[PDB]
Amino acid sequence: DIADLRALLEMSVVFSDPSQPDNPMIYVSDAFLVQTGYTLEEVLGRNCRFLQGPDTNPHAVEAIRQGLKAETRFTIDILNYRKDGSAFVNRLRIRPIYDPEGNLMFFAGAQNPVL
Amino acid sequence: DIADLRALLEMSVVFSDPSQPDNPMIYVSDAFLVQTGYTLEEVLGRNCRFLQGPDTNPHAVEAIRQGLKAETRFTIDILNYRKDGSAFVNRLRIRPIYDPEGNLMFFAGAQNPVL
Numbered sequence: 115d116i117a118d119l120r121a122l123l124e125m126s127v128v129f130s131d132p133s134q135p136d137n138p139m140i141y142v143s144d145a146f147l148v149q150t151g152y153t154l155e156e157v158l159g160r161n162c163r164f165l166q167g168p169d170t171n172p173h174a175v176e177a178i179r180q181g182l183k184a185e186t187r188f189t190i191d192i193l194n195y196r197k198d199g200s201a202f203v204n205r206l207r208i209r210p211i212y213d214p215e216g217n218l219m220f221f222a223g224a225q226n227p228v229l
Numbered sequence: 230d231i232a233d234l235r236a237l238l239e240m241s242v243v244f245s246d247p248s249q250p251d252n253p254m255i256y257v258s259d260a261f262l263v264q265t266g267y268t269l270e271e272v273l274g275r276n277c278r279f280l281q282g283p284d285t286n287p288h289a290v291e292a293i294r295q296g297l298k299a300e301t302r303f304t305i306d307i308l309n310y311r312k313d314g315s316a317f318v319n320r321l322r323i324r325p326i327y328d329p330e331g332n333l334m335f336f337a338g339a340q341n342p343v344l
């Protein structure tokens with residue numbers, strides 16, 4: 115049986131597991147894959163920083179890293195790239211998800227291109 | 230936000246996390262707590278072997294351990310005990326749950342007293 119992770123949420127959605135090394139994605143929606151130009155096999159198990167590219171702001175990247183450590187709700191606009199190298203401004207919304215014990219379980223991310 | 234783990238299942242249900250040390254319970258249903266006589270704080274974070282007691286069969290315990298390592302569906306009758314020390318035969322049904330990647334994510338257990 116496969117865990118229905120979407121039962122924890124028409125949008126680009128990602129779930130990551132901070133208990134695993136490098137905080138890898140464990141679920142991505144089809145909308146995410148279509149927008150970024152990747153297949154499921156290319157994404158699952160990797161950190162979502164593969165969306166970052168040559169002109170991505172390094173301070174924006176560090177802001178996200180600290181926001182994760184803070185375990186709080188945050189949103190940020192960051193330059194991301196598709197597999198074909200085309201760039202888009204990504205409005206990234208991230209929030210922590212806890213287990214009934216109160217321990218950090220997943221991060222949930224909802225993305226959408228800013229236009 | 231707390232993950233709705235029950236959205237991955239009137240019965241005694243338990244979820245454990247084999248990625249954490251000692252494969253601790255991360256969710257238990259109210260029915261489980263009522264039958265065993267424990268509070269939520271006494272259970273979450275512990276391995277479910279606290280239900281085992283003086284006359285529990287050690288081969289049955291080892292059978293469960295191997296069944297977990299096998300990552301397959303199994304059922305077994307094992308003598309368990311409530312907090313007050315009263316004993317009951319527990320029909321334990323266990324199955325593995327995987328993430329979209331195919332990695333083992335949780336174990337799910339459904340219990341009921343045999344009578």
Ligand SMILES: Cc1cc2nc3c(=O)[nH]c(=O)nc-3n(C[C@H](O)[C@H](O)[C@H](O)CO)c2cc1C
Nearest residue numbers: 128130161162163165166175178179221222223
């Ligand atoms: C659930 C989740 C979704 C994320 N989505 C994105 C994203 O769409 N684009 C991006 O550049 N970084 C994203 N990141 C940030 C990235 O994985 C990494 O944490 C940062 O680069 C800081 O190291 C995400 C992080 C998490 C936890």
Ligand SMILES: Cc1cc2nc3c(=O)[nH]c(=O)nc-3n(C[C@H](O)[C@H](O)[C@H](O)CO)c2cc1C
Nearest residue numbers: 243245276277278280281290293294336337338
């Ligand atoms: C999801 C799950 C539920 C379990 N429930 C019980 C139980 O109700 N009674 C019991 O004696 N052992 C139970 N066990 C077995 C126990 O936690 C431990 O794995 C065994 O004692 C073998 O080490 C359970 C194990 C898992 C993974």
